[PDB]
Amino acid sequence: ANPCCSNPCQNRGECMSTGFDQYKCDCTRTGFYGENCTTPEFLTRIKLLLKPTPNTVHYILTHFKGVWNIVNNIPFLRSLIMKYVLTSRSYLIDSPPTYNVHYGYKSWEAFSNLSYYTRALPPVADDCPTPMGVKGNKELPDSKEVLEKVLLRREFIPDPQGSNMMFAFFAQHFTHQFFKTDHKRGPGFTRGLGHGVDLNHIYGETLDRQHKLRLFKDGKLKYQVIGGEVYPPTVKDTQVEMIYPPHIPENLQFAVGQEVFGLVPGLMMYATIWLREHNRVCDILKQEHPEWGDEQLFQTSRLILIGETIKIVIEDYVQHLSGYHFKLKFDPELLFNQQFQYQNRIASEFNTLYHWHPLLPDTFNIEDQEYSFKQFLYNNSILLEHGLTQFVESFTRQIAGRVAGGRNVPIAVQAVAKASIDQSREMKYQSLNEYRKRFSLKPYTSFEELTGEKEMAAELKALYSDIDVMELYPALLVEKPRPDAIFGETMVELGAPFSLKGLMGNPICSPQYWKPSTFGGEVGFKIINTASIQSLICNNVKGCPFTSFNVQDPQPT
Amino acid sequence: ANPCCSNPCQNRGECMSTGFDQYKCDCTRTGFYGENCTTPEFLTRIKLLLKPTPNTVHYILTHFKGVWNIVNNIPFLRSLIMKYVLTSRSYLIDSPPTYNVHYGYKSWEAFSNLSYYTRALPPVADDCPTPMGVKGNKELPDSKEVLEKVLLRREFIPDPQGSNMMFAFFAQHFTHQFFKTDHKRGPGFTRGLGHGVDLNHIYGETLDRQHKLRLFKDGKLKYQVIGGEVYPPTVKDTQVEMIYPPHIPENLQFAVGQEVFGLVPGLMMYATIWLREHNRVCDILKQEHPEWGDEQLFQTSRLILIGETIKIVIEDYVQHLSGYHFKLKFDPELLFNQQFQYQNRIASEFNTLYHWHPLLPDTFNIEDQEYSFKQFLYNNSILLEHGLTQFVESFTRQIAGRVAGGRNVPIAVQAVAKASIDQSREMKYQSLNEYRKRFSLKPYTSFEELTGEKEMAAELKALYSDIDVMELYPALLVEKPRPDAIFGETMVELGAPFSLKGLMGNPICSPQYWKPSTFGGEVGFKIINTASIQSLICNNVKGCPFTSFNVQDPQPT
Numbered sequence A, B: 001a002n003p004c005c006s007n008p009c010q011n012r013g014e015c016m017s018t019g020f021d022q023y024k025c026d027c028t029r030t031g032f033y034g035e036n037c038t039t040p041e042f043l044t045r046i047k048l049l050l051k052p053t054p055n056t057v058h059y060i061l062t063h064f065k066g067v068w069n070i071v072n073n074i075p076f077l078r079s080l081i082m083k084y085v086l087t088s089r090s091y092l093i094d095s096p097p098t099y100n101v102h103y104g105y106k107s108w109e110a111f112s113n114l115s116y117y118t119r120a121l122p123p124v125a126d127d128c129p130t131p132m133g134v135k136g137n138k139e140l141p142d143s144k145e146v147l148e149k150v151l152l153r154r155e156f157i158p159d160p161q162g163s164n165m166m167f168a169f170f171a172q173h174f175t176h177q178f179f180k181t182d183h184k185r186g187p188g189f190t191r192g193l194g195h196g197v198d199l200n201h202i203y204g205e206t207l208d209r210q211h212k213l214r215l216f217k218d219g220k221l222k223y224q225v226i227g228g229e230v231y232p233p234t235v236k237d238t239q240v241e242m243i244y245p246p247h248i249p250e251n252l253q254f255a256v257g258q259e260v261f262g263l264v265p266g267l268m269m270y271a272t273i274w275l276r277e278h279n280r281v282c283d284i285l286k287q288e289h290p291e292w293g294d295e296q297l298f299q300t301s302r303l304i305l306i307g308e309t310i311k312i313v314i315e316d317y318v319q320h321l322s323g324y325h326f327k328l329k330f331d332p333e334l335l336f337n338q339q340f341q342y343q344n345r346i347a348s349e350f351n352t353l354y355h356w357h358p359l360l361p362d363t364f365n366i367e368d369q370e371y372s373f374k375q376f377l378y379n380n381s382i383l384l385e386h387g388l389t390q391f392v393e394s395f396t397r398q399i400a401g402r403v404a405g406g407r408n409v410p411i412a413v414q415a416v417a418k419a420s421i422d423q424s425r426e427m428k429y430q431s432l433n434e435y436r437k438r439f440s441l442k443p444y445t446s447f448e449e450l451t452g453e454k455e456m457a458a459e460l461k462a463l464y465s466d467i468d469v470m471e472l473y474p475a476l477l478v479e480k481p482r483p484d485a486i487f488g489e490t491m492v493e494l495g496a497p498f499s500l501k502g503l504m505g506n507p508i509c510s511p512q513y514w515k516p517s518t519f520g521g522e523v524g525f526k527i528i529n530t531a532s533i534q535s536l537i538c539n540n541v542k543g544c545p546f547t548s549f550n551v552q553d554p555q556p557t
């Protein structure tokens, strides 16, 4: 019924009904005009003929290694390119945020209510004739059929880029501070009201939980030492709520910032490393500032650990998954002469695309054990039996699974994958091709073009009939990968804007925060600017073991 | 003990202790270097020799009327000047925000906890030898003595600029949506978590209160009609909490967005006008959009009323109090090619400086009655007896009191003025002269320079001894006024940055919001861009009475 159901407006123009059977497009600042915003302005058709495709740019960034080696050693050149990456990627994100699961038009409720995930594309209106708007059938294909035909793992497919379990569990640990769905309200809602990198997964979402986790001596978090090594405190000693099944011994009920981190030992490994790092930084600050009290030591260490996190995420984590020869840079100063909003709201679609469960292996291999999912889940005694050193040695050399390319969701978490499809529909997501247009990509014109193969393409065509009705989440996991890559085009071109905006939109990146005194002086500032995944593991894990996000990297002798 | 107690760092450099008896200043991006950040960079001393004083600029803006008449009719010139006003005023405000009453250093707690008012200058540390830091006595002068000697009204002093009760009650109504101190927590805390112009004073701070105030037909707010005219609903009909003394008849217990608006009929007059305006806009939108439901009509009318408010505040309200011949402009488009953060956090000092109780008259005169404070307070039957038309006619011609110039706080609210001094001390405010330096003003070198007279100056010198120990709040009210003006220098030069930043920092001013479709099309957009205090009263008060913020303005025949 809604005349905007067909999504007639292009190029980020906005649709508005103007009667029961009529619409108008608002083409303001789109670069286009005309009824559906498709006639380019003169300056726009020039930029269009000059702009290279994402696959062209990706080819360039992943070849000519010798030229990038030159560029990487010319600081002004490296800065210039990183600046463009930041600004061109951030422009794709609405900031201040706009739509959410209940509001397909801008409203004060959608702007001000922080309990919602925001939305990059508005939901399909309730009174539309079909799920995607006007295209398709009265119903989308059975989600269990989609799952089983093109999503479920047969044989484990490894990641050609070499991503390991250090990478997989870093992904899970990092993202779980800002993907925290509020299930009491629904899939369109979040419990992470900080909407970004605030490290609430280490410190607690609320003040009360934080104070239970703190020692109130020297800025430190509470801890215990077992077999000479430092671990989180227990729930019995702190009274912090954690999710643990009934049979776990009290001594194994570790209490950390995020209540669900007892779920797997891989999460608890990173929780332990960052706990140790917080207390390490406290001791360094206390040496510089014998005059400081506990509160300032705590707050300043937290700011430093936020900086470390963003530094590592950009220069090690995103660096690895990008596959680029260009050396990415964490440098807030790059945006001080640019237009940029230091704020962020977590988008629902960002959460959806980050469901990388194909990363998970068939078994978790530590030392000479091959733990099944049943044995690994909620078993912190595995963590104590082997210790972190052994964990790092094993996870560094265990390959993760490929995310794009299809048929690699492990059957142990199939219910989560089915839920991803279902809840996506529940939240009235627009189609894959609408999302592609939203992020300046060419719509796919067939399923074979989407997957780059024949067999899954044929399954999908039988289930969906029209490529314009294909859904976002299953498309991301069956998409044709880039050459020898873990992801396809749609994953990179949607994820990068959310990512970079999320990272640089943090207040510590703003001019009034980004200065030595914020972090306790040059010593604290330097901890941020020299941080790396290797130095994080080196400083806080016994023996300073070698690590990396890539199984292919040789350990030196 | 804290080596930063003397506030050694100048020019917005930040002080940090580096041991028990040593400090370092961080001069990053200040324009200065050296130990206390006082050696200007080459580009800085040039700008310094060229910059005109605030009193010089104010003279220019309030003379040469004939030249401004020319400038005002050259749109590109008017735009150019208004743009500079916005950017140069906004630069004075830390955004993202920094300090608060508990944090004299940057911290994630001060950034993320929206229950605090933010702070333009950090609090004096707890372990400082004196209240102001190092200067002064062990104690500040008795606040009751300060109050009685230089603050309390003897004879009513009228405002030379002609501000009337329409102006006074607009000030109280408008500001009370973002000055809402949380007394359960303390003077450094707020209940207005929107931190700006969200119109929570009409719609309610929470979703629950909002839904009790809504009709859920046509986007409208609940209402009743008495003697042919529209008034807010009752608490009995809505169950909305309001503050009312025990004896008020249920039929006179009007329920509006802000719970304290039953306090005076002047507040309830504006609450009634804006209630009528919301429902007026609903009917206009429903005519354009017969296909829209109640929720979209409600949300869109709210966005339109936010725009109207900012438009009126800038072009009528601030225009009047400024005294400028230059015609101020509400135009978000002026900032689209500038660096600007679309966000705002309400500062404690902004709240403090806006305590304009000298505005209040000795009696409130409506028709031929002269109501005392005792008779006026909580008496909504005064509102019904006379009606809004009569209220507008009387308040338009009743002069408000002068704010600067001293001795004009009415004795009916002296306890509020004493509390302002006390709570200011409680919140460990730095001195007047520190605040002046913070906003690029020359410190006063004597009390006579501050007041521009001899008698109050001598009282203050006996109470305070040193001008460097003079406090911010009493200084604002005794300060030498500009010629024939309601305020002194410190009030304008502190208030304008908070104001303009607060107004333009609203998300409806951002590029993705500021477009016709956000407001239901060109008809809704036009309601914002042609709004004025006269058209607000004309459209919603019976007979369309003449109004203005100035008693001096002639009504046409």
Ligand code: HEM
Residues within 6 Å of the ligand: A168, A169, A171, A172, A175, A179, A180, A181, A264, A266, A351, A354, A355, A356, A357, A359, A360, A413, A416
């Ligand atoms: C270690 C094994 C893992 C298991 C058993 C697991 C299982 C689950 C389950 C059951 C959920 C849904 C829980 C709920 O109802 O809220 C979930 C959510 C999620 N998982 Fe996994 N997961 C694992 C690892 C990972 C990894 C490696 C990633 C990659 C980033 C990941 C990303 C996510 C995301 C983004 C969510 C959504 C979280 C939210 O919205 O709150 N998980 N996982």
Ligand code: HEM
Residues within 6 Å of the ligand: B168, B169, B171, B172, B175, B179, B180, B181, B264, B266, B351, B354, B355, B356, B357, B359, B360, B413, B416
């Ligand atoms: C109509 C007569 C007025 C009365 C009886 C009055 C009385 C009061 C009182 C008693 C308070 C403190 C209440 C509390 O404990 O929170 C207060 C606060 C305040 N008043 Fe007035 N006032 C009046 C008008 C005005 C006017 C014209 C202004 C000018 C803007 C104004 C500005 C303020 C401000 C800014 C506050 C602080 C509010 C807060 O922090 O929550 N008031 N007023």
Ligand SMILES: *[C@@H]1O[C@H](CO)[C@@H](O[C@@H]2O[C@H](CO)[C@@H](O[C@@H]3O[C@H](CO)[C@@H](O)[C@H](O)[C@H]3NC(C)=O)[C@H](O)[C@H]2NC(C)=O)[C@H](O)[C@H]1NC(C)=O
Residues within 6 Å of the ligand: A113, A114, A115, A116, A184, A185, A186, B206, B207, B208, B211
């Ligand atoms: C952000 O948006 C959320 C979604 O609209 C709001 O959550 C809704 O709050 C309603 C009350 O404010 C809840 O309804 C109430 O439920 C209780 C118990 O179930 C009843 O006693 C109430 O009568 C009932 N009222 C109504 C009108 O339904 C909703 O259940 C709840 N919705 C969801 C999906 O959780 C948030 O409150 C809002 N947050 C903020 C900060 O405004």
Ligand SMILES: *[C@@H]1O[C@H](CO)[C@@H](O[C@@H]2O[C@H](CO)[C@@H](O[C@@H]3O[C@H](CO)[C@@H](O)[C@H](O)[C@H]3NC(C)=O)[C@H](O)[C@H]2NC(C)=O)[C@H](O)[C@H]1NC(C)=O
Residues within 6 Å of the ligand: A206, A207, A208, A211, B113, B114, B115, B116, B184, B185, B186
């Ligand atoms: C923003 O900052 C506020 C000031 O720090 C926080 O308010 C404080 O919350 C404490 C609990 O989180 C309150 O203390 C508790 O009071 C109750 C009852 O009085 C006791 O049961 C608790 O044991 C006690 N705990 C402690 C550690 O004191 C403080 O009274 C309260 N302070 C003030 C001034 O109100 C806000 O919680 C915080 N808001 C957010 C969103 O984090």
Ligand SMILES: CCCCCCNC(=O)Oc1cccc(-c2ccc([C@H](C)C(=O)O)cc2F)c1
Residues within 6 Å of the ligand: A085, A089, A178, A195, A196, A197, A313, A318, A321, A322, A328, A344, A491, A492, A494, A495, A496, A497, A498, A499, A500, A501, A502, A503
């Ligand atoms: C709220 C903070 C969120 C930050 C999440 C960081 N991103 C992340 O962890 O995973 C993701 C998820 C999806 C895409 C990306 C990503 C891929 C490529 C690039 C290169 C540099 C490019 O721009 O071309 C940048 C990216 F960011 C990262």
Ligand SMILES: CCCCCCNC(=O)Oc1cccc(-c2ccc([C@H](C)C(=O)O)cc2F)c1
Residues within 6 Å of the ligand: B085, B089, B178, B195, B196, B197, B313, B318, B321, B322, B328, B344, B491, B492, B494, B495, B496, B497, B498, B499, B500, B501, B502, B503
């Ligand atoms: C959160 C939103 C707050 C907005 C409050 C609006 N300001 C207000 O109502 O009162 C105030 C309070 C104090 C000063 C001013 C003010 C004075 C002069 C000027 C001119 C234009 C100049 O720049 O030179 C601008 C101003 F803003 C307004």
Ligand SMILES: CCCCCCCCO[C@@H]1O[C@H](CO)[C@@H](O)[C@H](O)[C@H]1O
Residues within 6 Å of the ligand: A051, A052, A053, A054, A057, A060, A061, A081, A084, A085, A088, A089, A439, A440
């Ligand atoms: C080749 C020199 C480095 C260029 C870095 C570009 C990084 C990402 O640039 C991206 O390119 C895409 C396709 O052009 C666009 O769709 C995105 O808007 C743009 O951000």
Ligand SMILES: CCCCCCCCO[C@@H]1O[C@H](CO)[C@@H](O)[C@H](O)[C@H]1O
Residues within 6 Å of the ligand: A053, A055, A056, A059, A060, A482, A483
């Ligand atoms: C002149 C600058 C170098 C251009 C490099 C060739 C353009 C990129 O070649 C790319 O190859 C990919 C292989 O999977 C294809 O998927 C893309 O469609 C294609 O654009």
Ligand SMILES: CCCCCCCCO[C@@H]1O[C@H](CO)[C@@H](O)[C@H](O)[C@H]1O
Residues within 6 Å of the ligand: B051, B052, B053, B054, B057, B060, B061, B081, B084, B085, B088, B089, B439, B440
């Ligand atoms: C005279 C032409 C119009 C100029 C408008 C200036 C409006 C306010 O400009 C103010 O001037 C003050 C003194 O120079 C400075 O201290 C403030 O930073 C600046 O914002």
Ligand SMILES: CCCCCCCCO[C@@H]1O[C@H](CO)[C@@H](O)[C@H](O)[C@H]1O
Residues within 6 Å of the ligand: B053, B055, B056, B059, B060, B482, B483
């Ligand atoms: C050359 C441009 C015109 C300059 C106008 C004269 C400078 C402003 O003259 C001002 O007069 C005020 C009167 O109260 C004084 O308080 C100020 O100190 C003074 O600067």
Ligand SMILES: *[C@@H]1O[C@H](CO)[C@@H](O)[C@H](O)[C@H]1NC(C)=O
Residues within 6 Å of the ligand: A006, A008, A034, A035, A036
């Ligand atoms: C706009 O889109 C509609 C279908 O949604 C189409 O019928 C019409 O031709 C388009 N208008 C123009 C000018 O292309």
Ligand SMILES: *[C@@H]1O[C@H](CO)[C@@H](O)[C@H](O)[C@H]1NC(C)=O
Residues within 6 Å of the ligand: A374, A375, A376, A379, A381, A382, A385
């Ligand atoms: C947990 O791991 C230990 C070995 O560390 C093993 O003995 C035990 O059976 C495991 N528990 C479960 C429930 O798998």
Ligand SMILES: *[C@@H]1O[C@H](CO)[C@@H](O)[C@H](O)[C@H]1NC(C)=O
Residues within 6 Å of the ligand: B006, B008, B034, B035, B036
């Ligand atoms: C810095 O200020 C201190 C007093 O706080 C003063 O003693 C010192 O001389 C100043 N330093 C310089 C270089 O002016």
Ligand SMILES: *[C@@H]1O[C@H](CO)[C@@H](O)[C@H](O)[C@H]1NC(C)=O
Residues within 6 Å of the ligand: B374, B375, B376, B379, B381, B382, B385
């Ligand atoms: C309220 O006003 C009415 C006149 O409108 C008057 O009769 C009454 O006495 C007033 N009440 C108080 C408590 O002053």
